[PDB]
């Protein structure tokens, strides 16, 4: 019989793994694509240092992750383990955004 | 007839450049005049702070048996001190990762 | 060659060998420490300028540097920073 | 020349990876598009300022140092790219 | 029988009143006493401008009131109407206090 | 002169007033002491800052300008006191 | 023998003091020189912002039938404008109060 | 004998009578306006100072101020301020 | 002998010609005498209204992704501002077209 | 050989680049603007003349023009036009 883990066990191992890891979790070139797409909405045909793209990737991942710890706090504060977009809206409203 | 040009960091027994920091204050436009002991005091404060953060970083690298300090070790050091994290809560380290933290309700029975 | 670009590599390396002769340093972590020291430096410079403005002081001296580091740094970090700076100020005062 | 859909380039498994880094055990299906919108908001907020810096620098190439300026403007100072 | 409002009606009316009002919700003299009590612990024989104590006041109700809308958002997130101190703790920690 | 527990000088009905200005409907009995501790932390931080201003000012008396400097140090700027 | 005195605020056609803002910027230590149009531009911006917020406060006062601007009027004017709220999300006002605001679940039935 | 103290009273009162000739004002509201106009003055001034540092310019021009307005003031107030300030700069240029 | 000539539009700092408008009012048979500030006031209000309709036209063109304003943009701008709409309800624009407007029962179902 | 003909193109061009540096213009849109400025000028001038006849005032001042624009321009447009013209006549008075 092919093994199947009970749910969340792999999720917890993922949590341990990616808390242990330091690297970026976003695909680099699609992120560059989206950054340039937002950029042309302000000024077209600009050039980018790849360092600027990596800095934006780091800051974006950090802001997202901190938002997710706040979301996790809200969800467990609501006595749930599944996060919801309303949790994110709550967290952003608490942060003053 | 000049004396030997001695260095003010050695005069205060310090590592950080007194002259460079004084030049930065003179050209950073914070006042037109700067008291002489002020960059010395600033450099000493900075040396103290760098000493503690580097010491914690080396301790963390030793804990991870690593002989060359890592930005991961910098994150682990800066976040595991209460006063340092209260000093630098809004500041992010590139490639720092996150603290290992799982809520107890997330943990299984 | 090119123009000189300022860096804090040598001083941080000396301080590292003061606290840990045995261990090494990565250059990206070196960039992190440069960002750190520049950030703290510009912070303290800012509150020094503000406090000198509040007392309408044309000269920035060590006493409000002490005030600002006591203001920003939390607790025993601030007190030991005061201690280290006071020691260095006395030693430079004695040349 | 133009770009039309790269917000979907931030795929669902990448958001899952970020959430596992965020300590999230379970993720709803409604999460991903809202996080895409939130990410879009944060990125546009920083990059409008970055464009402002770069144009004020009279450059057409975006530099990381301006990204540092923009991030520390919005209270989100990043270590590892200064200078 | 005597008149008696059902629970929450008086609360609604006083919420409307105090949102409409701007006047201080703290008795001034014990507030000044507490300010002197805390300040003596840090430096002896401290004297106060009364205006300084008042500014300390509106700062106090400002921070506290904003904390209670954060708490109310947490409570309505938690499907409750009665706030509990862990809601305040959540608001402080998500703000990063 | 020496004061002992003026933290309870912030009465429970005053806390109810503050909650109603925040639109809070129902308040637990556990709330008041916890909020007293929270406001204690807030006040001790800001008065530490304001004091440090005051002895740096070489003054014995706290001024409101020192207070507003302390609040703007914390990103909690207050208007209307000569700032 | 000498030209008659004419203000630079009038030279811009503005009310906000050009000379005062120029002196404050010079003594505020932001750069060792300053462009001539910079303080004029600054005073124009502050005059525009003051005028628009005074308009909003005037509307708030007229809606509550009061002739004079009140800090309550200022609070209502600023907090009901999402642009000015995002300008001043971290600004507190003395004796300002808050928006009259209730949650729908707090209302009966 | 009293030393003279600075305020924005005449300017705010005249612009109030421009925007609303029939509307009065309370004095502590004027104190709030004093704090507001001062606060925005150091916000724009500090932004202009650091932007002058970043391009290594020792002279802050209207371009720097306009850039700072685009930074701190979001959306429509920024572009309206740009238009009115450009008009003012143009009228000063004619002056 | 003679100072450099300064135009009254520049003295006002507004773009519309004060001298041209004053000459038009002198030769337009409206009064035997005209107060000096009256054509200035006229030029100011004209430049305000042209400025605002030019904002509306520029927004319309940018919404239509066009660099240059066209009479269709003028139609769309002037009909969607109610004060401007009833200001020019009886005023017709060359090649303006009409607003996109369909009555409710004209739609199916 | 031709005869010089008056138009308002260049002033509207300065106004357009003041409000939108990035936005162009078609010339027939400028013809519509020329009809606009001539028509509104004629309306205000005729109202001013008839008002000057009503009070038997042989001179039209900015008070009369203010009255006329308050009559024809509604409300929001009226109050902002009044503000702009008041500022303009004030700074002209200082000149």
Numbering used by the authors:
A (entry chain E), E (entry chain A): 37 to 133
B (entry chain C), G (entry chain G), I (entry chain Q): 10 to 118
C (entry chain D), H (entry chain H), J (entry chain R): 30 to 124
D (entry chain F), F (entry chain B): 20 to 102
Give sentences from the paper:
Here, we report cryo-EM structures of human H1-containing tetranucleosome arrays with four physiologically relevant NRLs. The structures show a zig-zag arrangement of nucleosomes, with nucleosomes 1 and 3 forming a stack. H1 binding to stacked nucleosomes depends on the NRL, whereas H1 always binds to the non-stacked nucleosomes 2 and 4. H1 contacts DNA with L1, the amino-terminal part of α2 together with L3, and α3 to stabilize the nucleosome and contribute to chromatin compaction.
The zig-zag arrangement is observed also in our 4×207 structure, in line with observations from in-cell mapping of DNA contacts. In all structures, nucleosomes 1 and 3 form a canonical stack, whereas nucleosome 2 is located in a DNA loop between the two stacking nucleosomes and is rotated relative to the nucleosome stack. H1 is absent from the stacked nucleosomes of the 4×177 array, but is present on nucleosome 1 in the 4×187 and 4×197 arrays, and is present on both stacked nucleosomes in the 4×207 array. Particularly high Δβ values are found for entry DNA at nucleosome 3, except for the 4×207 array, which is the only array where H1 is observed on nucleosome 3. In summary, as the NRL increases, nucleosome 2 moves farther away from the stacked nucleosomes and the trajectories of linker DNA at nucleosomes 1 and 3 progressively approach canonical values (Δβ = ~0). As a consequence, H1 can contact linker DNA, explaining H1 binding to stacked nucleosomes in arrays with longer NRLs. We find that longer NRLs are required to enable H1 binding to all nucleosomes of an array, thereby stabilizing nucleosomes and inhibiting chromatin remodeler activity.
